[PDB]
Amino acid sequence: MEQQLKDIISACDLAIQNEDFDTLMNYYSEDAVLVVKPGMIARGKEEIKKAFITIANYFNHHIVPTQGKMILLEAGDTVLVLSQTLLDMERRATYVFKKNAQGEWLCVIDNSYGTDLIG
């Protein structure tokens, strides 16, 4: 439930560090959407794969990300995840996963900015 999803997040978070986006795309749906940065979205597994490869080599001067509070709003088929990420300063994101027939939760909407996208 709240764990397997939290385990998929980490699984992906790692798949990104190991720069093996080939295994990272197994967690995304085919028509998924990923918000790279404000006013910049990638649609489809291919476009999203490229986005990660592009923004692969980027880092913040002295920064220590840390998983924080995480709420899950499950509505049967889909699930809205509100993941807070601590910097030392926080980053509240909104992810949407959809459980396919196989029973594996894939990501459909990846907006690491959450409602911050508005402001």
Added chain:
Amino acid sequence: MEQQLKDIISACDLAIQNEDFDTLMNYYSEDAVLVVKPGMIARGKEEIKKAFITIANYFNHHIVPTQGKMILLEAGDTVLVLSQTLLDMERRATYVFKKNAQGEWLCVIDNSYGTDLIG
């Protein structure tokens, strides 16, 4: 697109003022989830109907909040809506709609609090 959803919001917003939750439940999915207030969620059309009937009076509507910026992250089947509501002070919510076979977008996750649910 961005309008029909915005028109569904208003449609519901009104269905609530006219206290005719019978027509309001036509906009929600069957296994939908509604966040009434922090640490309080209603699951299923029935529970959600009761929730609205209960807080019919707890919340003084008529206080028509002003619609503001609204971002839509569509991923084929589902759609993540980031609606900002102005008070005069703002309220950034996160709604999730899913387009059924009939082609009508229903609400599956109604969290008028957005990422604020975390903090």
